[PDB]
Structure formats: structure tokens, C-alpha cells
Amino acid sequence: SGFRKMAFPSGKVEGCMVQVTCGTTTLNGLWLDDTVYCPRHVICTAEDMLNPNYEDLLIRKSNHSFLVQAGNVQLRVIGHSMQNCLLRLKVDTSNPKTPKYKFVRIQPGQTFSVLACYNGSPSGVYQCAMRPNHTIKGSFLNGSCGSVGFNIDYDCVSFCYMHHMELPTGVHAGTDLEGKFYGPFVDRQTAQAAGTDTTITLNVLAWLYAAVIAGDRWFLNRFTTTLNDFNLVAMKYNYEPLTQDHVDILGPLSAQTGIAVLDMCAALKELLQNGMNGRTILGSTILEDEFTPFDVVRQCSGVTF
Amino acid sequence: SSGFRKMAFPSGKVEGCMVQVTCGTTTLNGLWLDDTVYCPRHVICTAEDMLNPNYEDLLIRKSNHSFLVQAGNVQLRVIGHSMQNCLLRLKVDTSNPKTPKYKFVRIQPGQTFSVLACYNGSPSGVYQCAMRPNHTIKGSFLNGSCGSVGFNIDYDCVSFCYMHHMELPTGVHAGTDLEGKFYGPFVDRQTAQAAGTDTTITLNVLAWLYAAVIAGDRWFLNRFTTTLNDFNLVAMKYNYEPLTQDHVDILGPLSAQTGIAVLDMCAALKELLQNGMNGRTILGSTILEDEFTPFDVVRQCSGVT
């Protein structure tokens, strides 16, 4: 029934996006109830970015120092504490549109939707994956800082990521809605390239299962391999080690398609060694790894039995 | 040498316009703007009627109470109804409080928009796509996504351009504009109708190359140029849509911003099609993307909402 890289409906998040200003610096903020979230680095200039001592810079500021706006209306800040690398700002009024939500820390390989904003204004939405090296191959052209990543299960919003800095390498880094970074990074203007990335095997597998369940299986073969034997190969081509844990997860998918995980695993091995024949899997000329087995299940198995 | 994601328009505005329509055994989606609920007329059909309904007639059978319209839990009493092409217009006794400033507009082949995929009146995903040359859309529609709409946002105005009517043998999708009139030769019955052969949206590969260039990725540019005719007499051998003078004109803003002239970019693209890319990648990808329009670029690469 055709495939596509879907993202969650951003509506519930949009209603929380606000702008936060300090001096000449302005970025996005997350307004949930009476509290507002934004990168603690909003309180820094071209100066305070080389080697700031946030604790020192925060005492030097007041509630009055923060300009929080709701579209085109100011929200007054009446309190403020710093948690990790994020600022928690108290405001006189609460957000009516605050949805039901949770703050969860995401695992590399997992996926989410990002609502890229500029000046607290929803600009666009897209789905990506937390790269194995904790970065994200996103499009955060200058300004998106403070934007958030999230998942929507039912009517509950799970916030997992907030954009903080535009890495020198070109990819983007951030934290969880708790101020804790995703990766070996810090909100400093120091050079700090990204670690060695890898391909998400689990996701590459779920994808091949999707292609198959989508009536396309020219890559499936006769052979079958063992786990150690698959890694020996996959790890050659820069793929992430596949574990028993990963094979479990691909269980339900293994059912539906009648193909077993090690089998499908044998197929991939063949794709890595024998190239892709110039042929295509789901229109893609390459192997897509930004679809978790869960995502596939939510796109090739409708919304019912 | 940075990041640039294919993004969808924030879905909030359209989310609050999605209702569920139920007319007997069938349950699809409806667009609710002001006091009218739009949806596919084939909602008044069941199993075998779908072979060649005589709607006009079967529409007299139907009664206002026949239509069950729901928005969450609220009951939208339908106090009127009339057909328009392949659309059914249901008058409800309640104007939609969330109705956004909007307009209906027919889209031209190649152009793009966002689709907020729905199920039983509730959103589940949002993605970007393009009206394919053959007049279909490579989307991800499963268990009756009929009634799901395609749109574009401008400032604060939502331009609805697409409504999903049915899946095609191709595993592709066909639908109409908000006036009920179909895209392509398709019809909302059931023959042996299939999509015609697809081609690459040349205009969009070009816009993308401009985007790469503006990104700082220009290894593919070259010292020469070409004639529209020779470019076509080449690209058409690689399955490309013939580039028209009107196309060249649309790239104007972009060729003006980069200093690179359309036929000079064609020259560049011409050679990209004859000697592959030799491992050389563009904007990261290893394949020339054709679903990003000239305006999509002007919109992203230019921090705005």
C-alpha cells in the first residue's frame, strides 16, 4: 500500500511553542502549564559562548531579563531555575493548550518528530532518528534552537528532544526535556565534531520486512546465517552490531511476512556484499535505516486487525 | 555541506478541521470548515454498489439523518446535503470554531503539499509529497484514509488542494481537489483503471540542485551551458519530464539568488545523468531528489513561517 517517512501531527506541540529573548539573543521555548523550557544558552552573547560559567551568568540575571512572548503577547516570568543545560522559567499565566505529556529519554536508533520553529513560530515538521552517535541528520538552518522532538501515542505527547546547538560537522545536538545532553556534547562554542556514526541494522531490517510485506521481495534468498556470522560481515560495512535483543523485536514482523529474522538477515548480508543490482527496494536505491520496526508496523499493518 | 530536510507544514490548522463521517457500513474522513463538511461521495456506497453507482439517484435515497458526523465525541447534526462533482457537501448546525483562514486551489502536476493522514476522523501522521506527473501520489494510505486532505500553508492561510478518494492497483493513490473534480483521468467507481507511466520531475531535481548550491555543495557545477532542446533530447532518455520554458522561468528566483543560470544548471545536471555521481553525494543523499519544489527551497533556505 505504498510507503513514506511519516511524522506525528504537530498540532498539540504548536500550542506550546513560544519565544524567549535575552539581550540580542532569541530562540524557541516550550510552554507547558506555568513553566517554560528553553536552552540555558539563551543567556549568552558572542562572548558568553567560548567558555561560560552558566551558574555565574544566571545569578547576574533577573526574571525581568527574560522576554517570553506568546505569538504577539508577553508572558511575564516570575521564577527561574537551571536544570542541567535547560532553563525552567515560571510565568504568571498557564497555557490552556498544554496537552497530556511525559518527558522520556530516547535511545539511539529510536525515532521521533521534530517541530522546527524560528522565533517561537512553527515552521515545519519532519521525522528523523536519533543517530547511533547521538546526532541527527536534520535540517536546522540557524534559528531552530529550542525546537523540540516528540512522539504521540494516543493523546499523550512524549517529549524526547530539544535542539541546542548546530554542530561544526554539520549535524545537530540537543538534550532531553530534562536538560541532559544526548551525546558527548556541551553548550560551548568549542569545536567538537561528531563520533563515528553507524547504520541502524535493526531499522534496515524492519525496512526490508516492510518492502516484502508490501509485495516486494526480490532480495530474499535461499541462504540463512547465524548471528555471529552476520555481524562479522555487517560490522565490516560499518553497520551496528545486531544482538539477540534486536532479533526479538523483529519477531512480530517475522510472523506476518513468514520470513525468519536470520533469513532476512541472510538477505541483507547478500545486499551488502553483492551491492543493490541498481535495482530498488521501495523506490529507494539505497538501504533506509530511519524506520524502527515499530514504525514499519504502524505503516504496513493499518490501524486494526 | 550541511542539513536540509524535506519538511511538512505544521498540521495544527488542519487537525482541528478533521471529522469522522459514517453513512451506514462505511466510515471515512471529512474536512470541516465553517458549517460544511466535505468528504468523498462514495461514502454513500457499500460493497458491490461501487461497481458503477448512480450517485445522483442513490443520493436521493439518502436522508440527512443517514449521515453520522462526529468531531471527537460531539455530534454534528447534518441539516443539509448536496453533491459537487465527486464531493459530498454536508451542512451541519455548527460552524467549526477552529476553522482557519482558508482557500481551495487546484494543484498543478509536480507541485507539492502536505497530507495529514487520518483514520475514523483522527490524525495519525503527516507527510510531504508531490502531485506526480501521471497524476497520482506516492503516499502511505491504509485502512480507508479516504477524505484525508492535502494542503499548503501561506502565512496564516491554508490552501486545501487535495482529498484522498481511493487506492490504486499501483499501491499508489488518486483523489480530487476541494471542488470534487479528480486529478488525472481517474474516477470514483471501479474499473481496471491504473496509473500511467511515471517520470522524474525535472523542475524539482533542478530546484534541489539550486538548494545544494546555496548550501555550499557545488562540486557538480561546470564551465558550460546547453540548449533547452539538447538537454531534453538527453534527459528524456533517462526518464525525465521534458523541461519547458515555463519551467525555466519558475527557477528564476533561485537562479537569481545563486547567480547560476537555468541552462547552466541543466548543463550540470545533464552530465550528472551521463556519468553518474561516482560515489560523490549531494546534500548527503546519493540520488537526485525530485519532490522538493522551487518554492519549497525559497521557503526553507529562508528562515520563515
Swiss-Prot record, chain B:
Reported effect of changing residue 190 to P?
In strain: Isolate BJ02
Q: Which residues form the active site?
A: 42, 146
- In this chain the Peptidase C30 domain maps to 2-305
Top-level taxon:
Viruses
Per the UniProt entry, the signal peptide is: none
Topological domain spans for side Cytoplasmic: 2-305
- List the subcellular locations: Host cytoplasm; Host Golgi apparatus
Catalysed reactions, semicolon-separated: TSAVLQ-|-SGFRK-NH2 and SGVTFQ-|-GKFKK the two peptides corresponding to the two self-cleavage sites of the SARS 3C-like proteinase are the two most reactive peptide substrates. The enzyme exhibits a strong preference for substrates containing Gln at P1 position and Leu at P2 position
* Main function: Cleaves the C-terminus of replicase polyprotein at 11 sites. Recognizes substrates containing the core sequence [ILMVF]-Q-|-[SGACN]. May cleave human NLRP1 in lung epithelial cells, thereby activating the NLRP1 inflammasome pathway. Also able to bind an ADP-ribose-1''-phosphate (ADRP). May cleave host ATP6V1G1 thereby modifying host vacuoles intracellular pH.
Self-association and partners: Monomer. Homodimer. Only the homodimer shows catalytic activity.
Protein known as: 3C-like proteinase nsp5
The record lists the organism as Severe acute respiratory syndrome coronavirus
Gene name for this UniProt entry = rep
Covered part of the full sequence, start to end and full length, is 3241 to 3544 of 7073
